[PDB]
Enzyme design. Sequence first.
Site, PDB file in Angstrom:
ATOM      1  N   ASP A  40       0.841  -1.193   0.000  1.00 52.75           N
ATOM      2  CA  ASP A  40       0.000   0.000   0.000  1.00 52.75           C
ATOM      3  C   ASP A  40       0.879   1.246   0.000  1.00 52.75           C
ATOM      4  O   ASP A  40       1.663   1.458   0.931  1.00 52.75           O
ATOM      5  CB  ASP A  40      -0.935  -0.003   1.206  1.00 52.75           C
ATOM      6  CG  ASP A  40      -2.061   1.005   1.071  1.00 52.75           C
ATOM      7  OD1 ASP A  40      -2.740   1.003   0.023  1.00 52.75           O
ATOM      8  OD2 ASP A  40      -2.268   1.798   2.014  1.00 52.75           O
ATOM      9  N   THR A  47      -4.393   5.500  -2.543  1.00 50.61           N
ATOM     10  CA  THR A  47      -3.338   6.452  -2.207  1.00 50.61           C
ATOM     11  C   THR A  47      -2.220   6.429  -3.238  1.00 50.61           C
ATOM     12  O   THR A  47      -1.553   7.446  -3.454  1.00 50.61           O
ATOM     13  CB  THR A  47      -2.780   6.153  -0.817  1.00 50.61           C
ATOM     14  OG1 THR A  47      -2.022   4.938  -0.855  1.00 50.61           O
ATOM     15  CG2 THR A  47      -3.910   6.005   0.189  1.00 50.61           C
ATOM     16  N   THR A  48      -1.992   5.281  -3.874  1.00 52.10           N
ATOM     17  CA  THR A  48      -1.043   5.224  -4.976  1.00 52.10           C
ATOM     18  C   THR A  48      -1.521   6.040  -6.169  1.00 52.10           C
ATOM     19  O   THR A  48      -0.700   6.609  -6.896  1.00 52.10           O
ATOM     20  CB  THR A  48      -0.820   3.775  -5.400  1.00 52.10           C
ATOM     21  OG1 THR A  48      -2.087   3.163  -5.669  1.00 52.10           O
ATOM     22  CG2 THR A  48      -0.119   3.000  -4.304  1.00 52.10           C
ATOM     23  N   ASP A  77      -6.323  -2.145   5.176  1.00 55.31           N
ATOM     24  CA  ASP A  77      -6.819  -1.550   3.938  1.00 55.31           C
ATOM     25  C   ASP A  77      -8.177  -2.126   3.552  1.00 55.31           C
ATOM     26  O   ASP A  77      -9.057  -1.396   3.077  1.00 55.31           O
ATOM     27  CB  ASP A  77      -5.802  -1.756   2.817  1.00 55.31           C
ATOM     28  CG  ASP A  77      -6.135  -0.955   1.576  1.00 55.31           C
ATOM     29  OD1 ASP A  77      -5.855   0.262   1.560  1.00 55.31           O
ATOM     30  OD2 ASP A  77      -6.673  -1.541   0.616  1.00 55.31           O
TER      31      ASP A  77
HETATM   32  N1  LIG Z   1      -8.182  -7.545 -10.645  1.00 58.35           N
HETATM   33  C1  LIG Z   1      -7.740  -6.342 -11.085  1.00 58.35           C
HETATM   34  N2  LIG Z   1      -7.467  -6.135 -12.390  1.00 58.35           N
HETATM   35  C2  LIG Z   1      -7.028  -4.945 -12.836  1.00 58.35           C
HETATM   36  N3  LIG Z   1      -6.825  -3.876 -12.046  1.00 58.35           N
HETATM   37  C3  LIG Z   1      -7.061  -3.942 -10.716  1.00 58.35           C
HETATM   38  C4  LIG Z   1      -7.542  -5.210 -10.150  1.00 58.35           C
HETATM   39  N4  LIG Z   1      -7.689  -5.011  -8.829  1.00 58.35           N
HETATM   40  C5  LIG Z   1      -7.335  -3.727  -8.570  1.00 58.35           C
HETATM   41  N5  LIG Z   1      -6.955  -3.091  -9.692  1.00 58.35           N
HETATM   42  C6  LIG Z   1      -6.510  -1.677  -9.775  1.00 58.35           C
HETATM   43  O1  LIG Z   1      -5.237  -1.516  -9.146  1.00 58.35           O
HETATM   44  C7  LIG Z   1      -5.192  -0.263  -8.465  1.00 58.35           C
HETATM   45  C8  LIG Z   1      -4.330  -0.359  -7.213  1.00 58.35           C
HETATM   46  O2  LIG Z   1      -5.071  -0.973  -6.160  1.00 58.35           O
HETATM   47  P1  LIG Z   1      -4.350  -1.416  -4.789  1.00 58.35           P
HETATM   48  O3  LIG Z   1      -2.874  -1.567  -5.068  1.00 58.35           O
HETATM   49  O4  LIG Z   1      -5.125  -2.583  -4.228  1.00 58.35           O
HETATM   50  O5  LIG Z   1      -4.564  -0.183  -3.772  1.00 58.35           O
HETATM   51  P2  LIG Z   1      -4.279   1.348  -4.171  1.00 58.35           P
HETATM   52  O6  LIG Z   1      -5.429   1.701  -5.081  1.00 58.35           O
HETATM   53  O7  LIG Z   1      -4.282   2.072  -2.846  1.00 58.35           O
HETATM   54  O8  LIG Z   1      -2.934   1.299  -4.852  1.00 58.35           O
HETATM   55  C9  LIG Z   1      -6.630   0.114  -8.151  1.00 58.35           C
HETATM   56  O9  LIG Z   1      -6.855   1.494  -8.451  1.00 58.35           O
HETATM   57  C10 LIG Z   1      -7.485  -0.767  -9.041  1.00 58.35           C
HETATM   58  O10 LIG Z   1      -8.208   0.036  -9.978  1.00 58.35           O
END
Ligand SMILES: Nc1ncnc2c1ncn2[C@@H]1O[C@H](COP(=O)(O)OP(=O)(O)O)[C@@H](O)[C@H]1O
Lengths: 525, 526, 540, 104
Positions: C72, C105-106, C403
Amino acid sequence: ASLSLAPVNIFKAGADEERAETARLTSFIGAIAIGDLVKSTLGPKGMDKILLSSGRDASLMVTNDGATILKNIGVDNPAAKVLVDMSRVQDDEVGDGTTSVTVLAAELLREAESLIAKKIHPQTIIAGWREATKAAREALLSSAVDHGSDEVKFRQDLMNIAGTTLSSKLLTHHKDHFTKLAVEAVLRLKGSGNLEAIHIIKKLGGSLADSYLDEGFLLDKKIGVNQPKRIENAKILIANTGMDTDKIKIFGSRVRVDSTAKVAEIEHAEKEKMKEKVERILKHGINCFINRQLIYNYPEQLFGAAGVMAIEHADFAGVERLALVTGGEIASTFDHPELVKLGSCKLIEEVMIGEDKLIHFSGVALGEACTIVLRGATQQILDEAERSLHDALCVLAQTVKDSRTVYGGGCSEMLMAHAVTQLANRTPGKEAVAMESYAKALRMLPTIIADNAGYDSADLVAQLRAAHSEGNTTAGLDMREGTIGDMAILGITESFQVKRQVLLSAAEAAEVILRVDNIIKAAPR
Amino acid sequence: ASLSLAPVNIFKAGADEERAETARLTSFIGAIAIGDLVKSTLGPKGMDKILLSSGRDASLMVTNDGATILKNIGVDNPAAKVLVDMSRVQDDEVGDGTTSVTVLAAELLREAESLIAKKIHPQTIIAGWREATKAAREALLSSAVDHGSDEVKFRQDLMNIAGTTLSSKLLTHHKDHFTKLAVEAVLRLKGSGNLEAIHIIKKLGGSLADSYLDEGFLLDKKIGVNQPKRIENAKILIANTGMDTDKIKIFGSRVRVDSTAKVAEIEHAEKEKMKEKVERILKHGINCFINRQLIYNYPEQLFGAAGVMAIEHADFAGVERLALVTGGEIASTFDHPELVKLGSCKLIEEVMIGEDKLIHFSGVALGEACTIVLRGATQQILDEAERSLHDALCVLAQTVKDSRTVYGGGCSEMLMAHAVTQLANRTPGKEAVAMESYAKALRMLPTIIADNAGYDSADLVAQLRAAHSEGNTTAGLDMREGTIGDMAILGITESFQVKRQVLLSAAEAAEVILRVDNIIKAAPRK
Amino acid sequence: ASMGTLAFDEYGRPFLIIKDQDRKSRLMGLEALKSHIMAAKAVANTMRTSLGPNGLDKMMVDKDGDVTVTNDGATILSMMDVDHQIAKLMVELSKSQDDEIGDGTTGVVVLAGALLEEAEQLLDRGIHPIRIADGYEQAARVAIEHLDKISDSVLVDIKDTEPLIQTAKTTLGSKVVNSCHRQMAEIAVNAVLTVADMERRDVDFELIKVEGKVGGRLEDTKLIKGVIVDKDFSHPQMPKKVEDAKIAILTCPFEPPKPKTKHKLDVTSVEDYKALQKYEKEKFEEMIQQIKETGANLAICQWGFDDEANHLLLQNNLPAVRWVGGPEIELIAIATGGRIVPRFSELTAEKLGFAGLVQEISFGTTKDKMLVIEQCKNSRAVTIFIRGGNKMIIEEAKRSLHDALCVIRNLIRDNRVVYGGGAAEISCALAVSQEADKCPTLEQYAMRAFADALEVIPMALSENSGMNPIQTMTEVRARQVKEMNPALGIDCLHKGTNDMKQQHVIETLIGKKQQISLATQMVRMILKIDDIRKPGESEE
Amino acid sequence: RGKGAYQDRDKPAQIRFSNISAAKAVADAIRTSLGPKGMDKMIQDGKGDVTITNDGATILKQMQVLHPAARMLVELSKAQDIEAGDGTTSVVIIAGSLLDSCTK
Ligand SMILES: Nc1ncnc2c1ncn2[C@@H]1O[C@H](COP(=O)(O)OP(=O)(O)O)[C@@H](O)[C@H]1O
Ligand SMILES: Nc1ncnc2c1ncn2[C@@H]1O[C@H](COP(=O)(O)OP(=O)(O)O)[C@@H](O)[C@H]1O
Ligand SMILES: Nc1ncnc2c1ncn2[C@@H]1O[C@H](COP(=O)(O)OP(=O)(O)O)[C@@H](O)[C@H]1O
Ligand SMILES: Nc1ncnc2c1ncn2[C@@H]1O[C@H](COP(=O)(O)OP(=O)(O)O)[C@@H](O)[C@H]1O
């Protein structure tokens, strides 16, 4: 982008960032360095290691178990710190396989380096490794066998497992006798899972064969002067009182006198109070008395006049195990002599072994504590022997809790390797390549296990692979001649739970370490 | 009893020899460095490399071929010197595949140190590698094909082979035109291997597509002052005569005179002898004269009065090739007009390309030479163009000498992979493991081949493995799509002899390197 | 704009301008903005790799030598050695997004990175930051309008949590814990719904602590609806298991309290000494009878007790513990419904909390046990117990559950959600392209700059995994032109379909709009700041 | 489908970025002297040789630079001057801008 080739370095003094491949290179090189530092203790021919203290203490210890190296070693690579953390977790779980899980993790990381150099993404490697670990666990549980219901088979498997644990240690000369001794010791607890109850001693000199088991208790606290030196068939009471210059706990109290007559009156009052406390202690009907803190001249003189022995310097562990083995109850208020149970013992003596005066307990009532005599010329071999014995007790307790066992010595390793190779050639994609690298690390573990004996590896590995392909899932490598054969008939067996825990811990450690891409550093101090 | 921990030693000032295992480490890391410096230039997606000498000179090279890259590099590992030597041997034998054999040897030494870490002895490695090399050679012999008997088939194979060779170079854009030009030049040589008969000009300006193989020649010399600027259908005369500050070779004679009249008479004697020499030159019936040495003012003035062209500062190789292609002769005695041979020329003129004047030649008599104009943007792109053209000409000449061909581009590579795979599966022992590492390096060469473009490796390896399992000894990778294809149809063809030489040389160099155990260093001179 | 200003006056005299100007690098203006934007460049490019399920995990070694491997981004960059104030501003940006939503937050950091990516070329073209900021704000309004347009909401309430389970599994897919995503989603939703307020109120996270111990296996992670107590019983023979226990809150040591002010007591004669001894003995007697009067099962002592009190408790067979931390006392009192007890004066059986079940837990050969409390009929505190192979996978599980619970809290706050994974990013890029095509020309450069900035999320998602970014970009854009859908995006998990909705990925719309607004505001602020002072003395 | 090639090796890329940076240093040192509205260059020789002009290729002949990319840009400019004789200053600027585009 990378801060390695950047117009500015946004850092303090001594803090730096390196390119992704360089960062993983450093991390995994530290991990593999600690791995092969802990290496070379695998198999019955594991070479021992000195645990020296670089400081002025210069405490020198020798051990065959790598976990002892892991708990006491400087940390440079963060991945090395992760490795020691997971290895300590495994050691607290079970007493054997710690070096095994550490070396497996180190390999998994070094072939991870090789495979990333082979142009493979870490996530693909993680997925393939997860698939291979699932396959290996299902294969391991497929061949797992439990024989706890059959008491004769349970005892024979205990023999085999204790011998397996002691083979890697130098005690293989008396392996069988020490095995039956330790099995009797663990069964002396009547199913109790604790291990701090079993206590050990150290005596300089004498042959290793002189080591034996004492059913009672061994004590090394001196006896007073005026009290009689030996009285048997007495009642032992454990106390938590200071028993030294007992004074009022009120902080605000003070003495204001105008002459020394009142000073002498107060001194006599304190002496009379101490005498009253001594009489209150003696009211309990006790001859062998045990105390934690110091005993001064007046109480010891009163005890000698009363013909009652007082034992001081009995630490918390000693009184704990004495209460466990005799049923005595710890007391702090002596105003109720009949309201505290007194310890029951059959025979008490002060034996003379070596050049020291040791108090020996015989005919313990409860018997929920084992005392083991170990004889060695040097302290180093003594501590190695006691560490090996403790590891044997731990693995025996783990087997007692669950008797699901597998055939080790590379046998179950070949089961896992065969299953993973079958799945890898069954599956396409780079995941198959990653999990085949997993399988080759699995195969190379017993390779170096046997090569620690200066034997051949490829021929035995191929022979066992072919035999298990034929269905000889009970075939394992024999260290006696560096040959193959039925692993069970060798009387060398490994618990299935320990194998599963090691496999899972190695898998998780490799997965968490491999996900690291870049190394960032704060300001060092 | 070694030097790992010894109270006393035998060494000179700064001398410290090093043990066998660390000798293997150092030699193999040097070999890895050589392979890395020569790799990344493989396949049609090869990437050029720059050279910069560590001194202030900073020798700068731009070329897509690794042989020149390894020609100019500081050497400290003797195994690296071995690698440079074997690569140079391959270059002297044929033009293409030198980088292939170099990277094969480098990856073989990589797998050799990997096997050493795998706790195996070098002798078993060498035995297994010999057996695997034998098997791979047999498998390569299985699918060898020759089509040199038919002239049209031979020309088609030359087209395909030169196209494949130039694809790995930068000229892939005009590959077709360059291949046609190479075929024309090779067939104009009438099958001769005279590389000195081929020259390519490095002139600046223009676009690379404008390049052409002109039948004539180009002269870089300058026209005299009084001499005519255009002479047509002249006779080519080549001389070794000094005719500058002409003096007798006897150094034991000096002028010790008592009057300046003697010196003036002597000077009249040398000018008269110059006039006699000029008359001897002119009596041969010449109009274009070629000389190695310089020409003074009096001979050029007399020639301008005589209306005879004079060419100076033409080196021995150029004039010899001109005589070979035209019919002239090199001379030193002009008292034999009938015993001196002269050539036949048709067109001599001047051409202005950009801002430089060039004497253009055309209308050859024999045509046993090849000259190609190159419109390179810069000097380095030019150098790359001549290097690629020379490699194409060399591979075409080698195919002319030996017309046996195979289908490569990874297809043959996976063929050897399959052969060694069955050999390993059909025998036990560490020998099989060693030759399986062999075959794995063999398969790892196409890893670089395809990753010069960023394509998938394992999927294509499995696809080609299956294709060869059905027996498709023609199924190879295509950089356009990253899939399989018919190299015969797709035109990716390779000479059988070149590939066999590459494989054998790589195996031999690996065997040579693995047989060294200890390296000892004397006192360094620095 | 380096090493001060070279004038040396103008008639040949030595000249002084600023202190320590012999090596002072004076930074004002456009070059100062270049410096700030490139420092943000470095921060963003070093941080952005933690985006998407395939996104890798950074590690950090702090000033104390403690490692931290994290996925995160907020906690990844929360402990960075920030030097220039712009990095600190981005840190507060991340903190604001984190405590505002928890996830994404990323997204703000990478979006700001790309915004500045094209802003620096726009500045190189010679464009003053005011119009760039105005165009960026217009673009942010356009993007927010698109986000509102493509909204889609479902049910979130406590009775139905299957969409909540899918959302939690999707959120935790980016974390390494994705092995047992279903199990962690179920246990997390059970933990959050164990105690919660559904009337748009906060859930007491003071009473929900994510704590566990190393060992065992990952799938052993289970929910303990109660309180975890680290301490253990002092006596060996003392019983270890008590059921239907009553908590006796104790805030005083088992010793006679001493006067606060300095005091002196004069003991002079034998009678005085004996009187003090018997007074102290009767004080212990009164205290022990007062303790036994309540008849409580478990007594929790903050200040502990001495040996005599230990023996008296042993004889009374009343389980008790010593030296327990104050926050733990507050937690156990709230969970068991206990009342504050200052000392024995207000000690009675009517002010005792109730613990449903109390047990000692063993983890093999460790000699270090713990106390677990659960089965409380009125348990107001619930904790999740996590097992792992090492302490750092334990920490990663802690932050992953953190989270996931933050995402659940955001869902509970409002059901207004959208579909992530670059599909909404691609739709926003389409909207910004449309606005650029339909708005005055001079600011259209800032328009398309903002568009390319929003385009980085699929860029980073693709290059984290490894697929070709731009061909997928064009194909998905063409399909989105064919059909308007916030569910056409990158198939990071290689499921073979670009239908993002089919893959059960849900994220709160409020999170995305707040992300865009915060990123635009921070970028606009950084565009308007060109002053940093440095001494640059190059000390030795 | 899914992932393709991992592309593990990256150092020659950043080396090429360094080459492009040198090429742009030369390019924007050359850029100014284009057009009647333009102003002469800004380049001082390390040895100390001085020339003063508005035609670019003369400045191209001024520099005694280390990086081969700059040297071959000089070759490009002089080749263009030989071929046509005009726009030589434009060619270098175009080349540098293209190199930055390749960077991006
Ligand atoms: N199964 C998936 N396939 C494609 N993109 C995804 C999937 N799950 C999450 N994401 C995307 O990855 C991004 C990063 O999510 P995550 O790393 O869990 O937390 P954060 O959004 O705080 O970085 C999210 O904005 C989401 O849109
Ligand atoms: N007789 C034997 N034959 C083959 N392998 C053995 C034998 N005895 C023990 N081993 C293996 O050697 C390993 C070394 O054990 P030890 O050094 O005590 O701890 P660790 O298992 O952590 O290395 C054991 O894991 C066991 O599997
Ligand atoms: N179109 C193509 N497809 C696949 N492989 C090719 C193609 N063209 C050339 N190659 C291979 O690339 C290799 C590199 O050739 P080149 O760089 O010209 O000389 P060298 O082989 O000495 O490196 C050749 O050995 C050839 O087999
Ligand atoms: N009077 C003019 N008005 C507008 N542009 C001009 C004028 N004269 C020259 N230019 C421009 O200057 C550019 C470069 O010309 P010049 O500097 O002569 O060549 P070089 O750059 O090779 O020295 C041309 O593209 C031309 O358009």
